[PDB]
Amino acid sequence: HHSGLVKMSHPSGDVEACMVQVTCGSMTLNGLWLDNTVWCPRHVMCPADQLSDPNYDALLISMTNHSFSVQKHANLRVVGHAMQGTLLKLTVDVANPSTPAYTFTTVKPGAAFSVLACYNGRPTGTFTVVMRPNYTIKGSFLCGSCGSVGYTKEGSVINFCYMHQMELANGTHTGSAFDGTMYGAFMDKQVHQVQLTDKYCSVNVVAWLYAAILNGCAWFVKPNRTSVVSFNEWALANQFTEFVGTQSVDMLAVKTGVAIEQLLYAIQQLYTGFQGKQILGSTMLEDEFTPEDVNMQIMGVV
Amino acid sequence: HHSGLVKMSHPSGDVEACMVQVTCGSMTLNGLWLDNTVWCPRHVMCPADQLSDPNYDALLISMTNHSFSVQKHANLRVVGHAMQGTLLKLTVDVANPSTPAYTFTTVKPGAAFSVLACYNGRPTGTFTVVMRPNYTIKGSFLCGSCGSVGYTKEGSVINFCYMHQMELANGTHTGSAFDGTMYGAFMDKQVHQVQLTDKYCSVNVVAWLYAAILNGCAWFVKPNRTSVVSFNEWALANQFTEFVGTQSVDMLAVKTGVAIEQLLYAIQQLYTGFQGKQILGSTMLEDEFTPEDVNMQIMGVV
Ligand SMILES: *[C@@H](O)[C@H](C[C@@H]1CCNC1=O)NC(=O)[C@H](CC(C)C)NC(=O)OCC(C)(C)Sc1ccc(F)cc1
Ligand SMILES: *[C@@H](O)[C@H](C[C@@H]1CCNC1=O)NC(=O)[C@H](CC(C)C)NC(=O)OCC(C)(C)Sc1ccc(F)cc1
16 A cells, blocks of 8 residues: 655746856856845855865955856856855846745754755756755755755745755765855865764654554554653654654644554654564655655645 | 665656646646647546546537636636547647647656646646556545646656546556556546556666665675576566666666676565665665666766
């Protein structure tokens, strides 16, 4: 029995019209064109021989309005350049006519957002990722994918929350929010950086367990319950994130009739082993589906 | 170590502009607007009390050009209606100005295509699925999602290959190609239909095994080899599809330096059990990634 859950990505047509190509000399990447402002990663100015320890402040001063090349596949003239954190704020004389209603937001561990992967300013693919507790993502990025934007949708408003900056040694990826701050303790330099531990998202696993009940799989459900305070103490020593209930989780509980504390008890025993049984065709707990994802994809609740 | 493979979907901006809402009385669904032709599932005309065994030929004759309502969220007037297979060919007086270069094609088991899920003519999400050997897909569809289109991209040309029609008892989904034929032996009627067995795609599993070698995971590789003819005979009695090599598979073999026949031997022994080890963080063989997907996402080869 298929669960009915897939890695669902927001329609990217609105974001596609905001993609531009930014060239600052020997390197090119992607930029986000909203109104008269073009956002792009700040390491575009860096020469290839100085990628390990850039001095970005000196590089920015060395730049000139005419030395930024913005092209849409239409060529954009730069009338103002500024730096905020690990991002460049380039001003252009032409405002994007296809600018959607948008906000800037910071995504949190356990939350999912859609990513529009681009190369040379041309979108190539889209996918959805969940921001891991170590503030990395398990994406698919290659050379030239920097400037690809991660976003969430709330109605007709697009909340941009991610811009790809680097790939880690373990194959994961990390970027920066649109306030200039990279997620986690990572810095946009071509050096090895200490990566925090990754943890199972308790909120997402409970949502995944609830989706099993919504598909007829409830062999793991027992009337025994574990309190949120007891589960959180257990989670601290088992690489599990502390569980924080939300209204979305409550709807799954009220629909299925299974208490969250019942599932938290199940998570503790399912962690020790599935004992040869399967849930949703899987032998391991899944934290890649948010409670919202189960809410919309299964019951059509947004 | 993350593999670097995600469920990547084609950018859906081109297809989004081709989505319309088709209403034929008490039921509404989604339609594909290309040139002066609107395609939609044929059960839109059916009344809710006759969904189990429609007589579509009689229903079509009972219809009138004015009785089809096409709306884009712009209202389209219907000047011609015709039926081909399980699809309706509605002609409209206005050609879609955003019509992309497109072709109609039939997708095969083991191949992957992108799906734009829509409701009331408004796209809601996108995802990629692999057509299973039983000619079903493991999608995420709900009531009103019929008319959502599956497509592949070859350059700037979009090859439409799927239109959602129904959900099966096991939670999977099936649709029809744009020649009117449903995939597999399924018929667009609200009755239980016999579903063929599902099988592991040998081509996709070999691609998944190759991706492990490209990420440093090669514990399963042994110099022992199994010929394609011997593996195919083995596959016939183990719910595995017969393996057919392609140029895409050859590139992975030539890059990794591992023969395909070496992997086919590995598949036979990995089927009997992973013996407590993991590949790409999984304890089961994955056939949801095509050789092309590994080619583009890992090595940037399209
Ligand atoms: C976008 O331009 C690009 C995206 C990556 C290319 C390969 N895969 C990607 O996702 N980012 C960079 O080129 C980036 C630029 C720096 C100024 C931040 N370099 C980078 O992070 O390269 C990835 C490395 C694995 C090389 S970082 C690393 C890790 C260990 C180590 F020992 C040295 C460097
Ligand atoms: C699009 O209008 C819609 C898509 C499905 C709605 C629920 N999930 C979907 O993906 N398709 C239908 O409404 C479709 C129309 C028929 C004329 C083909 N009905 C349909 O296939 O419903 C799904 C069922 C599970 C009800 S089929 C079935 C299976 C076993 C059984 F015993 C009876 C009916």
